[PDB]
Structures are given as C-alpha cells and as structure tokens.
Design an enzyme around this catalytic site. Structure first.
Site, short mmCIF file in Angstrom:
data_model
loop_
_atom_site.label_atom_id
_atom_site.label_comp_id
_atom_site.label_asym_id
_atom_site.label_seq_id
_atom_site.Cartn_x
_atom_site.Cartn_y
_atom_site.Cartn_z
N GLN A 194 0.85 -1.18 0.00
CA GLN A 194 0.00 0.00 0.00
C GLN A 194 0.89 1.24 0.00
O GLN A 194 1.99 1.22 0.53
CB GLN A 194 -0.89 0.00 1.25
CG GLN A 194 -1.23 1.37 1.89
CD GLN A 194 -2.34 2.14 1.16
OE1 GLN A 194 -3.22 1.54 0.53
NE2 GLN A 194 -2.32 3.48 1.26
N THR A 195 0.43 2.30 -0.63
CA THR A 195 1.15 3.56 -0.65
C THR A 195 0.34 4.70 -1.23
O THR A 195 -0.54 4.50 -2.07
CB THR A 195 2.51 3.48 -1.43
OG1 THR A 195 3.07 4.79 -1.47
CG2 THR A 195 2.33 2.98 -2.85
N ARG A 196 0.64 5.90 -0.74
CA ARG A 196 -0.01 7.10 -1.22
C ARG A 196 1.13 8.07 -1.54
O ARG A 196 0.91 9.25 -1.64
CB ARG A 196 -0.91 7.71 -0.13
CG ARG A 196 -0.14 8.13 1.11
CD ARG A 196 -1.00 8.70 2.24
NE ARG A 196 -0.21 8.72 3.48
CZ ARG A 196 0.78 9.58 3.76
NH1 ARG A 196 1.13 10.54 2.91
NH2 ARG A 196 1.48 9.42 4.88
N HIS A 200 10.72 5.17 -3.77
CA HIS A 200 12.15 5.33 -3.97
C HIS A 200 12.82 3.97 -3.84
O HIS A 200 12.17 2.97 -3.47
CB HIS A 200 12.69 6.32 -2.96
CG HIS A 200 12.02 7.65 -3.06
ND1 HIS A 200 12.18 8.48 -4.15
CD2 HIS A 200 11.14 8.28 -2.24
CE1 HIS A 200 11.43 9.56 -4.00
NE2 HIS A 200 10.79 9.46 -2.85
N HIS A 203 11.84 1.50 -1.22
CA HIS A 203 10.56 0.82 -1.35
C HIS A 203 10.68 -0.33 -2.33
O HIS A 203 10.08 -1.39 -2.13
CB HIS A 203 9.48 1.81 -1.81
CG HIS A 203 9.47 3.07 -1.01
ND1 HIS A 203 9.20 3.08 0.34
CD2 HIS A 203 9.82 4.33 -1.34
CE1 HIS A 203 9.39 4.30 0.81
NE2 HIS A 203 9.77 5.07 -0.18
N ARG A 289 5.18 1.16 9.48
CA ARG A 289 5.33 1.94 10.71
C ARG A 289 4.33 3.09 10.56
O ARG A 289 4.33 3.76 9.55
CB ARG A 289 6.76 2.49 10.82
CG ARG A 289 7.11 3.10 12.18
CD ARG A 289 8.45 3.83 12.13
NE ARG A 289 8.59 4.78 13.23
CZ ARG A 289 9.03 4.48 14.45
NH1 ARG A 289 9.44 3.24 14.75
NH2 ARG A 289 9.10 5.43 15.38
N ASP A 290 3.49 3.29 11.57
CA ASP A 290 2.45 4.32 11.53
C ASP A 290 1.66 4.16 10.23
O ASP A 290 1.29 5.14 9.58
CB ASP A 290 3.05 5.74 11.62
CG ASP A 290 1.97 6.81 11.91
OD1 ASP A 290 2.27 8.02 11.73
OD2 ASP A 290 0.82 6.46 12.31
N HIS A 291 1.39 2.92 9.86
CA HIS A 291 0.64 2.62 8.64
C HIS A 291 -0.65 3.44 8.63
O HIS A 291 -1.39 3.50 9.62
CB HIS A 291 0.31 1.13 8.60
CG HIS A 291 -0.19 0.64 7.27
ND1 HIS A 291 -1.51 0.77 6.88
CD2 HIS A 291 0.44 -0.01 6.27
CE1 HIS A 291 -1.67 0.21 5.69
NE2 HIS A 291 -0.50 -0.27 5.30
N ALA A 292 -0.89 4.09 7.49
CA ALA A 292 -2.09 4.91 7.28
C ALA A 292 -2.33 5.93 8.38
O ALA A 292 -3.48 6.33 8.64
CB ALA A 292 -3.32 4.00 7.09
NA NA Z 1 5.82 4.18 1.37
#
Ligand code: NA
Ligand SMILES: [Ca+2]
Ligand SMILES: [Ca+2]
Ligand SMILES: [Ca+2]
Ligand SMILES: [Ca+2]
Ligand SMILES: [Ca+2]
Ligand SMILES: [Ca+2]
Ligand SMILES: [Ca+2]
Ligand SMILES: [Ca+2]
Ligand SMILES: [Mg+2]
Ligand SMILES: [Mg+2]
Ligand code: NA
Ligand code: NA
Ligand code: NA
Ligand code: NA
Ligand code: NA
Ligand code: NA
EC number: 2.7.7.4
Lengths: 510, 510, 255
Positions: A194-196, A200, A203, A289-292
């Site tokens: 997942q990503t918003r 880089h 990732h 870490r601190d997802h969403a």
């Molecule tokens: Na990310």
C-alpha cells in the site's frame, strides 16, 4: 484467499442483466436523485466492484453502530471503518425507508439505485472519538464535521456502472479482474504493498525482499482516490509507479491502482486495508510503521503510536485470512553500495545515508541534486517536472491596501522590470475586480509558472477562493511578506525591494 | 557631425527651468488633456530629446505637406517621414490655434505642453501613396487608416519629461548623452548599425568589418519602440544584444537603445534613420538591403526594391552630413571555418552555409539544433527561452458548436487524459461565458505554456478579443482543425483524435 | 628505432641508399614510396623527381641490393565501410573515400579545428596541436615601421595596455633590440614561447637574416607593410584599432 465474508460481492456482475432496466429507472422523471460527493464515488466504486465485500450498500444504523463501537458489522464480521452515505437535511427529509433513489456522478452519469433501509442523524462526536481517536485535527474528523453530511442514509445497492474514469483505464483493476490477472500467470502467493507516495529505491528493495521471504509475487497497489491532504497528485505518482515497476526483475511484479478514499485512520485503516487487499486477491500484505497514520498534530503529538497498526492487525490475525509480512525497513550503506534491513546494522559502527521527505522537498525546491542510491533518476526526473524548482515557479505580488503611490505605475514598473530578466517566465498585471471567476484563476496562473502583478487586494470574504501558495503581499503592515518602509515609498525603491525579495527566495537567478 | 539643422533641439535641457511651471500648468483644472497613443510616445520622445532635430513639435500642415510631396520641411530641410499628432474629431473640435494643451502618458504622467498652431484633416490617400507607396498592405498605411486619428494637430512643444520607461534605464541614451559617452572615450568616428531583429554571427562580423574599413568605433543602435508587426519583443532582443556586444573586441563597441517608432517605410525611412543617427552623434551609418522595408505583400510582390534605400540615401549624400558605409553582407565558409563577404565568393566554386529566418523559426519550433557558426550559443539559448519548442508550448482545444456529446464529460475526459502524460504542462478546463474579461486571458495561459480545454465557442463579435495562436477548433465543420467524423462521435474516439493531433503537431512527445 | 641519418632529399638515388642502409641495420625488406625521399616541386611548380623514379631505380638494382622491396600500396579511408583499403582496389567514381592533405591538416591545426579519428589517432593529434598551437596560442611581433611620425614610446604603451585588456594568458612585451644581434636573435624565442612583442623601431637590413620572419608583422605606411597605415601621423587610437582588428582577422585574438 476467499473474499471477506466468503463471497465476492461484485454487484456489477451480479446486476449485469438489469443494467438497462436500472439505467432506465435512474433516468425516470419521478425518481429522487443524489449527486455523489468525491469521497462517496471512491466508496461506491469499492462497494460495487466487491472491494468492500461483504458490504453490498452503505451501512444502516444497526451495522454502523457496531462498526463504531465493536469494529464489526452487526453479524460480527470484522469491519473497522464505517462506510455511509452522508447527506444534508433537505434531502434526508425527502426520503423514507423503502424509497428507491438514484446515485449519479457529475449530475449526469447514473451509477446505482439505492433502496433506502433507514435515514438517521449520527452523533459525530462519538464516531470522531471512537473511530478516529478524537483529535479535532485528524483529517477524518475535519472531514467528518466540515464536509460530510449530517444524515446517514443506509441501504442496499444495485449497480448500473462504476464511477467513470478516463485516465489509466488499463490499470484500474477490479477485484475479479485482478484475481484473473494473477490466475492467468499462475500466481497464488501475492504480497501487496500500500502507498499514497512516490516510491524510492528503499521501497523497491523492501518489496522485493518481501517477495523473497514470503515466496510471493509482488502487487504494488497504490491508492489513487483520496489520500492525505498535501500528498502528491496521483498522475505524478502513477507516472512514478509505472517507472519503478520496470526496475523489478521481469515477471515478479504487477501494478494495479486502487480507487480508495483513505481516512488516514491509522490502525483501524490498516485492518481495513488488509481486508480490502484480501478481496482483491492478495495472499500477503505489509503493514508499515504508523501505517495509514496522518502523523503528528499541531502540539507535535502523534495521532497514532508507530506500532499501533501492526499490533491491531496482529490481534485480528486469526480471522483476517491474509498473511501479514513483517515490515523490515531498509537503509543505504555507502561503504558497501547496498541496502540492508535497518534492524541488521549498528547505527554507531556502520555508515548509513538517507534523505528525509523534508530534505527531498528542499532539494526539489532549489533544483539540487538527488543521488541515484536514493531514488532512480527516471523517478526523480518525474518529481522535478510536477514540482519544479523556484526559478521555474510562478508567483504573485499583491499591491497592498496601504499603498499611496500610483498602483497603475507601480504595476507597470514591476512588469517592465521583470521582463528584463530571462528564464521564460510569463508575466501579467492581473485585475480580478474582486470577481470570483477571476480570483479562482490566480493559482492556475501560478501553477503554470506565471508571474502575476495584482494592483489591489481582494475582499476578506474572498480569501478562501485564492490559494495562498507563492502569493506575496507588498504592504506597510507587519503581516506583509515584502514590507514597505512607508506607504509613499518611491516606486523605484519598491521595485528593488520586490526584485531582491524574489531573488532571495529563488524565483530569479542571475 | 553637427545635428540636422545645426542645433540639437534637446527640449528637455532647453526647458529645464520651466519644468515646475509647465508641470503645474499640465495639472491645471482648465487645461485640455490628450492621452498620447503608443506611437506618439515613441515620436515625442525623439522630438523632446533632439532625436528629430530640427523638429521642435508635431508638424503643422505647411511643413507636413512639404514632407509629403517634397520630402522636406517648408524651409527646405531634408525630412522624409511626417511626424504629426493624430487625434479624433471630438478632440480636434475642442481646439483652436494658440490653444495650449497637455500631453499625458497613461492618463497620469504629464509629458509636455503643446501650443497649437493649426488643426487639419489630412487626405490620407495622398500621404498613403506619396509617403508609403500606396499598397494597402503596407503596415504604415494600415496604421494610417485603421489606427491613426483623422485630424492632425500641428504645434510647438515644451518639455516636462520624456516618456517613462522602467526597463533598461542605463541603455536608453538621449542624443546629448550618447554624444558625451563617445566624447569621454575620445571616439570621433562611429559607425551605427540599425536593427529590429536578433543579431547572429553574420551581423557581428559585418559590423566589425565596417569598423575596420571606416576606421570607426561601433554603435549597435537597436530600435525598441515599435518595429515590424510580428517582430520578436524588445526584451528578448535587448537580452540578445547585451549578449552579443560581449563578443566584440574590448572597447570597440557600444550598445544604446533607440525608442523609435518605425514606419517600415523603406527608402524614405532609411534617409530618416541616417538623419536620426547623425543627431545621436554617429559619423557613419550602414544602409542595408531592403533597409527598413516590410518585404512582400500578399501577391508576393516587393513593397520596395532591394536597393531603393541605398540609392535614395546616396542621392542625398551631399546634404546628409553622415557617411554611409557600403553594405557588405557576409556568409559562412564551412571549408575555411570563416565568414567572408558574399561579393567575394563564387557560389558555384565555393561552399557556403546559412540559415534563413524560416528555417531558424522551424528549428526553434521543433527544438532542433542551431550551429555555433550561425549564432553564438548564449544568443540561441535566449531565443529558445522566449520562443519555446512545441513540447513546451501552450494551446487550447475549443469544443465546437456542432458537438452533441456531453461537453462536461468530453472536457473531463480530455483533462484526465492529458494529465496522464508527463512534461509539466499545466491544464485547465476554461469557461469564458463569452465574457471579455475571461476571453482576453486565453493567450496569457497559452503564453504561459498551459493547455486549455474550452467547453464551448465564444460569439463571433468576440473573435478579435482572442489571439488565434495555438488555438484549435474541434468540430464537424470543414473549417475545424480537428475534424469530427460526426457530431455524436463517441467521447473516447474524440479524445484519441485530439491526442494524436497534438502529437502530430509536437505538443506531446512520447 | 631512430636513425641519425642526414637526408639529402635526393629522390631515387637516396631511395637506393636507404635500402642499403636498412640492409646494414638488419632489415630483410623495405618499402619505397611514391616520390620516395623526393623534395617535391620547385618554384615553377615542376617535380624535382617523377613519382616513380625511386621505385624504378631500386628495382633496376634489385639483383644486387640483397634486400627485398615490398610494393607500396597506399591506403585510403572508406566512410561507408568504416575501414581503410588499398587505393588500387577502389573505384574513385563508384566508392566514397576521405582523406586530409597536409595543407588541410596544417590549416586545421592553425585554426584549432577538429581532426577526425579515422585520419589520425587522438593521442597523436594531441601531440601535434601542442608543438604547433593554433593562432589564439601563437606568439607574434608588431614592428613599428620607420615611416611612423607619431610618438613611438606612446604607441607602444598604447598597444601594450590595449593587448593586456584581452584575456587568453598571452604574455606581452615592448621589446627594444637596439639593433644588437644578441637581442634580435631572441625575437623568435619569445614568439615561439607564445608571446606578443611590440617593437618600437625596425632593425637595420644587414640584420634581417638574424630574425626569423614567422608571425612578424610590419606596421608602416609603405606598400610592403602587413598592417598599412593610412598616413605616417595617423592618430594613435586609430593605429591601435588597425592592429587589434588585424590580429583578430588573423586569429591571434578571439572574443
Ligand atoms: Na511508502
Ligand atoms: Ca454539520
Ligand atoms: Ca512519534
Ligand atoms: Ca511622504
Ligand atoms: Ca478614419
Ligand atoms: Ca525581391
Ligand atoms: Ca448517432
Ligand atoms: Ca607530380
Ligand atoms: Ca598631418
Ligand atoms: Mg471507475
Ligand atoms: Mg523615456
Ligand atoms: Na483462506
Ligand atoms: Na499506542
Ligand atoms: Na559636418
Ligand atoms: Na539585421
Ligand atoms: Na525600385
Ligand atoms: Na622520370
């Protein structure tokens, strides 16, 4: 694995043979119409395409309440984020249970017919506290109070068609479609990411290691609906993903876009993301870490603890039915020309380099170099284009209300002066006459890289219409960006003050 | 040499001790005011600073008539271009001889006081034929009929100040000032070069040879008032001059800007340029091929013969009192890595290369290479900036009146589609609502490199408001740039037609 | 291996001599070229030797030379094939060939122009450019002619101050030789060093021989002057311009 609840609620497929009938009903003269808000389009697409299985409509109060306090649907199905159709009082009053209403897009495209089960006014203080933790600065609470309607309409949905999108038709795979794409490649172990944000080298590295450790293929599933406020636009981001996906070893990765409307609801959202990816066909998922999480509030305090997400998802492990791969962030080792899991190196014994978002933003603002160990050059080229450095940025100079010199002459002086400099920036003395139709054009010009000279200020009841980015006030007042020594300062002196201000800020380079 | 007529009519210096008095009169309540047109500002600056010696005001009918037929002032002084104050009937009627009126700039800056000697309505057909040769397409005749007032006010001028300019304050030398600049360097032989265009290697070479043959220092005196329609803007051009002047051997050249309003009146203008440069202090002047000629008309016929100018100036040689250096155009010899006078090489025996304006324009439009033997790189870099290639050009797509598909959806489809592509161009669905205040913004956006999607056409009585550059009509009609197969063609097909059209034309590059 | 021979440039006779000499040095074979050891053409443009006199003479002594003579097969470059091939194998009018004559090579070197790798290896060209630098790096001398009536001390000072404005690193000197041989013989050393010399007056004719004439230019009213003065008393500033523009036209100065 099987869809959450056991059945993929692909309503588009379910209602395929009622499309003409439903379409005709939606276009009837007597039917009550509701224009879907941008977030509701995000949500209805996920309901209609089965992305939100077992949901088959917007939550009624019975289910909604259980989700708010129990984190489950009334039937006990794990479901952490309430998905409701929020409307204003005027519309809520026109509807009663059993009423069939039509849900449109852009006031012209029929999406679905909703059979009203109930109409209710939720206590937004409880939802705010229970679901989003209560901080008035949480983007979900802000939306909850300032944008969302005060009345929720619960009901079952029947599909006409998914929200229209003309960009990236190839990449917006529905759950059924993605599942067939994996099936045709014989992929039965797939780890989703997942990503918003832009991706880089780190990732890319971490997702490939994930693939190696889980013995799974990779699914880069970026969100392209609503993400965090201030995020980079999805067009730019999709360009970056399409670029980085080419850096994986052939046949290991697949790029698919997710039209989700994030709530940035930390640990609850993390659970929701797991469920959603399970519906789309992933067997594994990485929770970060601190997802969403939206970060820290004004007082600098964390909206969520860095491991709340991973801990919450782990507590639901026995019923999620999708494996969660541990998040092993990687960092670059200059001396070894490689990336390695941060949990494997001794900070005080081994050299590591990394570029924070803040620093990346700076470099981009000043046109500075960004190393290939951080991000691939083709990815950086894209970021520089969507976010050009200051010499290529537009701006506006607003002649403050305190000015007693001739506004027509000062504007002409500024224009003639700016026009001397090179660089290709386009200039305009822009008169808005306090007209909204003109004020709303200011940021478009700035977004176009243009330099605008605005002879007088607009009324305060219009501030909201104009974005404040790269807009500078020339005034005697203390709150001016370019402070005048006095209201009648000589025009040539004022011009110098402006030129040197723009130079100090990087807009002009000699 | 001495100023034409023997005296430098620097009215600014003459009237230095009446500045406050004149300024006060110009600001009186009872005085009749006239706002100077942009061309009149060009002319009055040259009258006031002595650039037009012996003129000391705008020509009355007695002088004007002699200039029209005899090419001289009534006293017999050679003077080929009539300089008059053209006004409309409404104003002409309010004035009678001996009336003192004030001449303002931008309706706010007093320039001078004119003591009316006469008011008259000139026969513009005679002036058109006699002075400008009669072709209705001659820019001077076009101006003469479509822009210039129908009544000429002749009278003596008294100076308050020269037309205000905030750009290039250092380079706008008046005749007296330039003469002191030459005097302080002990230059007493100076060859002047006229131009309204960028200067390439050939111009640098030819001016230096001129210097060598005339044993004179060089004066690059570009026009920065009004030049030919379609010419490159003077800011761009000044940037180029400032750049090329650095390519002369140290101490041989001086750059000074001339706020002249050219009439593009060929041989007559050539004479006028000689007189003007003599007033500014030049001892020599180069008259070129078709000097100050506008070229050919629609029928492809020459407005002037290529040597009319040189021949006319030569016929006045004994009274011009400024030496005219022969024009020896140079061309590049690939095989010898040098430029040589075209009159010295055998076309069919020796290799020569050159880039026509047409070809230069093409290369710039497509971002192609331009060789250093043609123009210095720093000069080319400047030209590319002011005139970017197609991938960096703005444009507009107008949804024609024939369209029956949904305009709101087609526009949205185009936007979403364009946004996929990279390159940094900014996009906007622009609604003008047939309002002039919005229509006039179209070319500003295009000039800014932006891509505009315009949902519907504006009324014909508004065409004039919108420039037609890079504006394309999407319609079923034959006169459409992007022709639709039919009025109801599917949106996706239309989108493709537009994308491929923009690609074919270079706006998009993949 | 280097040969300390003193050539006579005696064409065919010398070609024979070269064969004998190489046989003594141990070679079994030797190549005799076109106009081998020939000095070229005289003033009237006529050949000192015919292009094949050498090869023919050596061939006539073949039975007693006791060293095999390999036929001379000159090669030329084929652009379209990226290769060199014997000139006797290609049809001039049917196949593309490129080559750079000595004259052209000399020009390119004088103007600092490019010389393609198909002609000569870059490391070889770099060496040639160093020993024979282009005009912007060449020394020179300006001799104030005997016809000058302006002040020689001031004209020289004006030229110096002027040259010193320009960049490029060339070193400048107002050089007084006082007709002394020990000083005149230093002129070409300075020029060879890339320097720019301003010489206030001419040396006596019985001294010409002492000074090389390369890059030495006479500023005078006379017809035989390289930089001709309009008159003996022309204003110093005008003279300076004439010199600067002359040196520019000839490539010594580049702006
Ligand atoms: Na990310
Ligand atoms: Ca409310
Ligand atoms: Ca923290
Ligand atoms: Ca004051
Ligand atoms: Ca008229
Ligand atoms: Ca012609
Ligand atoms: Ca049809
Ligand atoms: Ca021969
Ligand atoms: Ca004399
Ligand atoms: Mg969709
Ligand atoms: Mg002025
Ligand atoms: Na399972
Ligand atoms: Na916690
Ligand atoms: Na005279
Ligand atoms: Na020109
Ligand atoms: Na003619
Ligand atoms: Na012979």
């Amino acid at each position: 694995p099987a869809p959450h609840g056991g059945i993929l609620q692909d309503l588009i497929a379910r209602d395929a043979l009622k499309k003409n009938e439903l379409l005709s009903e939606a276009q009837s003269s007597d039917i009550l119409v509701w224009n879907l808000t941008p977030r509701q389009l995000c949500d209805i697409e996920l309901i209609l395409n089965g992305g939100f299985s077992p949901l088959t409509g917007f939550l009624n109060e019975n289910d909604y309440s259980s989700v708010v306090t129990d984190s489950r649907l009334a039937d006990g199905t794990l479901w952490t984020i309430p998905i409701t159709l929020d409307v204003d009082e005027a519309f809520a009053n026109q509807i009663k249970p059993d009423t069939r209403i039509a849900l449109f897009q852009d006031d012209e495209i029929p999406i679905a017919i909703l059979t009203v089960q109930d109409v209710y006014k939720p206590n937004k203080t409880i939802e705010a506290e229970k679901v989003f933790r209560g901080d008035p600065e949480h983007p979900a609470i802000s939306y909850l109070f300032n944008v969302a309607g005060d009345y929720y309409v619960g009901g079952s949905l029947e599909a006409i068609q998914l929200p229209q999108h003309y960009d990236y038709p190839g990449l917006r795979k529905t759950p059924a479609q993605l599942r067939l794409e994996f099936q045709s490649r014989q992929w039965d172990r797939v780890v989703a990411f997942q990503t918003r944000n832009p991706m880089h080298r780190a990732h890319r590295e971490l997702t490939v290691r994930a693939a190696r450790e889980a013995n799974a293929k990779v699914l880069i599933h970026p969100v392209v609906g609503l993400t965090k406020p201030g995020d980079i636009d999805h067009h730019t981001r999709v360009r970056v993903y399409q670029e980085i996906i080419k850096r994986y070893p052939n046949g290991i990765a697949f790029l698919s876009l997710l039209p989700l409307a994030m709530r940035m609801s930390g640990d609850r959202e993390a659970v929701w993301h797991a469920i959603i990816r399970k519906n789309y066909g992933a067997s594994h998922f990485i929770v970060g870490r601190d997802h969403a999480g939206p970060g820290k509030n004004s007082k600098g305090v964390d909206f969520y603890g860095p491991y709340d997400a991973q801990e919450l998802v782990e507590s639901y492990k026995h019923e999620l039915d999708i494996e969660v791969v541990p998040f092993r962030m990687v960092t670059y080792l200059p001396d070894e020309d490689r990336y390695a899991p941060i949990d494997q190196i001794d900070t005080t014994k081994t050299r590591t380099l990394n570029i924070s978002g803040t620093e990346l933003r700076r470099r981009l603002r000043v046109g500075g170099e960004i190393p290939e160990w951080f991000s691939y050059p083709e990815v950086v080229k894209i970021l520089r284009e969507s976010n050009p450095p200051r010499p290529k940025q537009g701006f506006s100079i607003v002649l403050g209300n305190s000015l007693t010199v001739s506004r027509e002459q000062l504007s002409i002086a500024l224009l003639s002066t700016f026009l001397q400099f090179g660089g290709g920036r386009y200039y305009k003395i822009f008169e808005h006459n306090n007209k909204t139709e003109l004020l709303s054009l200011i940021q478009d010009f700035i977004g176009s890289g243009s330099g605008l000279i605005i002879p007088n200020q607009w009324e305060d009841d219009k501030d909201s219409v104009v974005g404040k980015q790269n807009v500078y006030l020339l005034d005697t007042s203390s709150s001016a960006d370019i402070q005048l020594e006095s209201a009648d300062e000589p025009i040539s002196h004022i011009v110098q003050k402006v030129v040197l201000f723009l130079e100090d800020n990087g807009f002009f380079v000699f």
